[PDB]
Amino acid sequence: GVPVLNTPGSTQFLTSDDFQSPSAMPQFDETPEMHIPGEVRNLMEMAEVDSVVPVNNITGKTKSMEAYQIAVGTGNTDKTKPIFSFQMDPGYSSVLKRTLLGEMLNYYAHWSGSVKLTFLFCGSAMATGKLLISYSPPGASVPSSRKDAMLGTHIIWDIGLQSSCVLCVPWISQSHYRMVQQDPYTSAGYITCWYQTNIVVPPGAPTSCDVLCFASACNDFSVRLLRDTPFMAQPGKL
Amino acid sequence: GVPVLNTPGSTQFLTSDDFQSPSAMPQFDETPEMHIPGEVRNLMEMAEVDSVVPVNNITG
Amino acid sequence: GVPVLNTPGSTQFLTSDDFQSPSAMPQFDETPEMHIPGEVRNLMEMAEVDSVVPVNNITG
Amino acid sequence: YTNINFYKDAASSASNRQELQQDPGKFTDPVKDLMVKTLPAL
Amino acid sequence: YTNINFYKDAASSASNRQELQQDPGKFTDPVKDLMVKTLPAL
Amino acid sequence: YTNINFYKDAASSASNRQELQQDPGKFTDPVKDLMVKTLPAL
Amino acid sequence: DRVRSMTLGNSTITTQESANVVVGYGEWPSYLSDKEATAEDQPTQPDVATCRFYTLESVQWEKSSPGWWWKFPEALKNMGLFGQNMHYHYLGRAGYTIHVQCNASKFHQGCLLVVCVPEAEMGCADTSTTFPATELTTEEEPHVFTSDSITGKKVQAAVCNAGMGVGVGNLTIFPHQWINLRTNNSATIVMPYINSVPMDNMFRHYNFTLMIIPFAPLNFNEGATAYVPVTVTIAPMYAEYNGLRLASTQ
Amino acid sequence: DRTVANTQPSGPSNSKEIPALTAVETGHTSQVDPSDTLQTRHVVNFHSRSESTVENFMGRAACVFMDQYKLNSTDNFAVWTINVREMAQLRRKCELFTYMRFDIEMTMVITSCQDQGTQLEQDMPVLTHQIMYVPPGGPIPAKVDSYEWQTSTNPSVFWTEGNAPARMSIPFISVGNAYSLFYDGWSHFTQDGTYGYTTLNAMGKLFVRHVNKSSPHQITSTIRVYFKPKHIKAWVPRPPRLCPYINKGDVNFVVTEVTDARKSITDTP
Amino acid sequence: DRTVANTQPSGPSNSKEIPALTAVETGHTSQVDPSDTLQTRHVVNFHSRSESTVENFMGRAACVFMDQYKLNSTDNFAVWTINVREMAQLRRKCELFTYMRFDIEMTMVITSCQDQGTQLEQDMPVLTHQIMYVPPGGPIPAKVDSYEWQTSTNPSVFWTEGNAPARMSIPFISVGNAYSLFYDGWSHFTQDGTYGYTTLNAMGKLFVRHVNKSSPHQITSTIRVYFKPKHIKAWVPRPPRLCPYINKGDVNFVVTEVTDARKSITDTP
Amino acid sequence: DRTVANTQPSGPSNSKEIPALTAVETGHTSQVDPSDTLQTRHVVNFHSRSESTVENFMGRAACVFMDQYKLNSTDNFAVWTINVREMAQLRRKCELFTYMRFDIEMTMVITSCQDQGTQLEQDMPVLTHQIMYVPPGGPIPAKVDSYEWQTSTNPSVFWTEGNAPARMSIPFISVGNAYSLFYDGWSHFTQDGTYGYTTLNAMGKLFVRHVNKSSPHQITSTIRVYFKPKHIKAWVPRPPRLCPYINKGDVNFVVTEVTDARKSITDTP
Ligand SMILES: CCCCCCCCCCCCCCCC(=O)O
Ligand SMILES: CCCCCCCCCCCCCCCC(=O)O
Ligand SMILES: CCCCCCCCCCCCCCCC(=O)O
């Protein structure tokens, strides 16, 4: 007859608890294990893998293959205007919301780390050109000229044999963590591209080419708070 | 007054559980054991024994 | 089946008690601490600080 | 745990569910004379 | 008892109600130069 | 506590929530030949 | 590093512009061990006869081509002694190396994605019924995707979802390589055996699916060659078979 | 529980090293760090990827089944085939891997409510419920008072209302070496039958009933089951499902959109 | 918990050894292994015969008795002679051995329900039940308020409704060295009386009743008893019973069929 | 647990030491002791400042929320944004410091009562309640039978009435290094939006509902939540709030009086 006193919180079911429970099947023998290649252990490994980003999310292209194609041209017209522009925020920006990084980010409410974006030039081997890609830290309006975009984190890409260049955002934030949802207190910056030089092609070559972008997380990325994804809904019984 | 917290799954009866229970008859003395030939211990021993198979299971 | 006997005072909520309780969020990682100047530890430190006294509390 | 008895009586104990002992020779081979598989039976 | 934790998490622990540490010098004496009670202040 | 098992069965145990092991090289770097970041890829 | 040479059996493949080969998940294919074995018999292990390159039919990459898919290992039947052993054997194990060839001049542009999806499951266009097995596998010609929603007792071949109900751009998680006409003209992927059971019947189970989807459309000017062929070559490796009986006519 | 990598100081550099330039046709993901392309200071990172693990991600209960049985023909008991493809919330999470091994920790919640009628005057004692798991191939009851209810060998749980919810643990009970969520094959060897993962799913059925024989007026009850996977191992990560689910049996879907439409290519909200 | 035997490699052989040939008139079962007649590889078997043991096979509760008693003459209490030949589910399992020693772990489930009447307005407190085991030769109660109910020496259990089911353990209480399930003899020495196993069964009776004296309206209760054998030993295995049971007292049966009829000798479905 | 300082003996003194004289413009508080200006004896003080600590001061439960939900549209469930600025009793205590780190130990008390109606004859079983904490950004239920209630990832607690009150523990879940009770800033970078501490408060919502589907007659329930901070650290002490609170969102106030009026300067009651 050991004297015991019950404490508040007894006889309750909490989803996030670890308690021992009696086994329904006693002394069951399981099948021997086998080595299956490709064992994932953490969910950040999937985030690190590169995925294509639907930059051209304009109307009429969200249900086709043209959403991933960033068109480039060779001309004298509109050489002072941005090629593309979007928000750096991975959580809610439509451009990169549904990517592999975004999908895993929508199961969490906090995030931190750095993100890297690479660009592939899908054009003729004889074509050559240069491009300027810049990241503007938050605190000012979106840049409207290349003079405004050359005062931030920028890299000059020379198209050639390598055919790919990587841009890294170096985690400039006031706090240690940011919020996946849109909140004015914590927000990222903007990504913009500009023409360093025009694209020159020899006679007999296609005039227009395409560029594709890939986004992935760095080795210092982490997520702390756990929530449910907002991309799934069940109206009725299946 | 040791503080304890009840866990889900209490006050239930599961057929396949092993728990100690109070004895109805305390200090009962059983009859001494005796050696009875033919002690089965596993149910696969009976399976190993050969048995006739009704192959001709046709009607009648 | 350890025999236990409940004692009076069980299944009650007292405001001034210290008991362990299950955690809603398991294995959560908190933000690293930072040194913030001006850490109060006892409430008598605030009492020791001098304050102005409204002696002339007359009407108006 | 799993080896502590809180009751004096022996019947007030858990079942022995981790014992594995076999002896199929009682039924499969009841012959008095030894028979070799390689050698002919008769 | 009173020093045994039955839960792995650190937040699932009792409050620290037996700690007594004080430092009134932060607020009572914030002056850069030392002041002696016996000696005149100025 | 936290390391005592009151049940013989292995499935009747708490979840392993304090294990941290990673291997991103399986997916990030599946190439047969080693690639150096400083050196050109091709 | 561009040049590479692969020799298996009595066949050899030579390439002058290519990238480093990709091993699936970092594990080279091998033979089953005794501890992981479950069968009780002596496996037959042909080496030269059933492990060599087999060149499939080629296809033309037109400007409006949406893509193609193949469902191995059934596509490898009736070719050589690999298919013949399949008919007479209930169980089998094998590994594969996939080489895809597509060449163009310096005045042509375009990009291709080559990816192997393990245990890819295809849904029907009509959600309330199922499709015949002919739609998934034909064993002679590649099945083509489409750029619009289709109807009937057929798979949803829309390139947007790829027939699996997932984003087309997220397929890079699986082992893959890219074929950019400006840089390379050949892609090689080595895949190990991946299955829940150590061995399984080849005919009724489709281990993996090879999908080629053009992200960048092919474009060229007048006077250039308009017929660009795409050829796929696969070679089984470490073939093992257990269980011998009468041949299965299928 | 180790932390993430720290940042190393960098300075101006002019040389032939090209960390930024790479080739994406090889199939390799670049390992460039922010220090490689910018001038950075030295910071010590104590952040840990402790909640991103598969075990912690899957370690939370989710609803899998819901049904109603009444006490006053076939409405007095409920029958459920044990499958994890009936609730979208848990189906999406478990379809990110091809093969998985795990041990479930099932729990149930049972509630009862009197039905609205003209006459409601009644006094009833406490209620008791029985849950029986029939192994595959076992006899299935056809009536509330059928002979299968006496569980000589099958497991059973009896839970009187008012107490804590019942909980049980089940080990790995798959014939193969793992649970195959996606199966690309046909049941028959002639490439016929049922195409999908239904062939490999051979889990048994579950039966719930009221122990009390009768009540003066009708009473209805609802049972909800929650599953928590533990001791979990995963293989072959898969992309998330974009399109909403249509039917539990198959993976049929409708054409959807990759991302939300924007006004223009250079439109920043 | 050892595993089963592994397979050893074999090769082609031509010699005078004849493992396959044997004689079945000797009464010995052949010990031929698959390696002896075929060419086999080497495999390591980790399968264990852990659930085929008698203790694990018998280690599961089964229903043995069911009856109803009412609260408002002889209907207020129930009388049961303790026998294991009343439920077919457990009778078939325990008739595979001639002699057995075991210790039971009995448990009971008690439910109550109000009876359907014209007037049902009543308010009643919780109910309590008493179960008494009368040793062989002891006085048997004849009324609910009889004097035998005060258990000076007999065991008793009181269980208020709403709590966990009661459980008790009983040791080996047989006069002989084991429980004789099958007895081929007559009670009297003149080869007369009752033929069967009823003579050796001398177990006592069980009595259940309501502790509460009366209720404004009739209430009925049902008790179910489950037995789990533990610390079990078995002797003389017996073939399973083919024909369905007819009467609890004896082993009388009707002529049945060995196997299901097939179309022909060479008919494969 | 040390004691306070003891008193030291003093005697008559005539010298140039001036402990009493000081300057208050320096910003330093004088450290004069009673022995310095008077003749005192020697006493040993054993008094300890053990209950003046911040941890003990904050270590007591306080009510933070109260609402009603009914069982019979949007009245069947309650929604609460987790904030500590709704009850004056705890708001005043927690506004004495600018920044604070603490771990709460929440508990709930749930009571139910039948509503007064013309017809009150009903018999109902025990009631069960569910409490779900939606993380920030998570979907919010819009109906009692909505799909968000199946907590695949969100935490939940089920408490049957009649048992002990439920209790849970929550760790430090702030993005920053501490909880900023007072924030002197604007949400937007253009000095617009909402001014106050509401911008930094990003805590999630709480949902409570009835598990039982329906009742013959309406029943209403009330839930009260209590918070106890533990493992607490405080910074930047602040003066107590004089004026009574007006609105939870902001710190708006009305002009009040410093002290109670007296008759005259030399008036002693
Ligand atoms: C009610 C008491 C007995 C309950 C027995 C346990 C319930 C049986 C469920 C076993 C299968 C669990 C895992 C299957 C998941 C899957 O099919 O992928
Ligand atoms: C109700 C409390 C007292 C109960 C006493 C225990 C019940 C008596 C049963 C004893 C016999 C058990 C084993 C007999 C089986 C058999 O007859 O073969
Ligand atoms: C009902 C079970 C789940 C309950 C989850 C815990 C409740 C969430 C509250 C977290 C915030 C606590 C501290 C916030 C105080 C503040 O805002 O200053």
Please describe what this structure looks like.
This is part of a larger assembly, with three copies of chain A, three copies of chain D (42 residues), one copy of chain G (250 residues) and three copies of chain H (269 residues). Chain A is mainly beta and 238 residues long. Chain A has one domain. In chain A, 6% of the residues lie in helices and 30% in strands. Chain A has three helices and 14 strands. The longest helix of chain A has 6 residues, at 100-105. The longest helix of chain D has 4 residues, at 25-28. Chain G has 250 residues and is mostly beta strands. The longest helix of chain G is centred in the middle third of the chain and has 9 residues, at 80-88. Chain G starts with a strand and ends in a 6-residue tail after the last strand. By secondary structure, chain H is mainly β. Chain H has one domain (1-269). In chain H, strands 1, 3, 6, 7, 9 and 10 form a six-stranded antiparallel sheet that branches. Chain H has a four-stranded antiparallel sheet with strand order 2-8-4-5, with no helix packed on it. Chain H has three helices and ten strands. Chains A and H meet through strand 3, helix 1, strand 6, strand 8 and strand 11 of A and helix 1, helix 3, strand 3, strand 6 and strand 10 of H. The PDB classes it as virus. Keywords: Echo 18, pH5.5, virus. Echo 18 at pH5.5.
Strand composition percent of chain D: under 5%
Shape of chain H: elongated
Report the bound ligands by name, code or SMILES: palmitic acid
Task: Count the DSSP helices of chain H.
Answer: 3
Rg from Cα of chain D: 21 Å
Order of helices and strands of chain D: H
Q: SSE order of chain H in H/E notation?
A: HHEEHEEEEEEEE
- Based on helices, strands and strand pairing, what is the structural class of chain D? little secondary structure
The first-to-last residue Cα distance of chain D is: 57 Å
Total discrete domains of chain D: 1
Give a short account of the largest sheet of chain D: none
Structure summary, number of beta strands of chain D: 0
Specify the helix fraction band of chain D.
Answer: under 10%
**Approximately how much helix is present in the residues of chain H?**
under 10%
Shape of chain D: rod-shaped
PDB class: virus
Keywords: Echo 18, pH5.5, virus
Entry title: Echo 18 at pH5.5
Chains A, B, C: VP3
Topology:
This is part of a larger assembly, with 3 copies of chain A, 3 copies of chain D (42 residues), 1 copy of chain G (250 residues) and 3 copies of chain H (269 residues).
Chain D: H1 25-28
Chain G: E1 4-8, E2 11-15, E3 22-23, E4 54-55, E5 59-60, E6 68-72, H1 80-88, E7 89-101, E8 109-118, H2 133-136, E9 143-144, E10 176-180, E11 186-191, E12 208-219, E13 229-244
Parallel strand pairs in G: 3-11
Antiparallel strand pairs in G: 1-2, 4-13, 5-13, 6-9, 6-12, 7-11, 7-13, 8-10, 8-12
Chain H: H1 34-37, H2 54-58, E1 62-71, E2 78-81, H3 88-94, E3 97-114, E4 128-134, E5 156-160, E6 167-170, E7 179-180, E8 205-210, E9 219-227, E10 229-237
The complex binds palmitic acid (3 copies).
The site of one palmitic acid has 15 residues of chain I, from strand 3, strand 4 and strand 6.
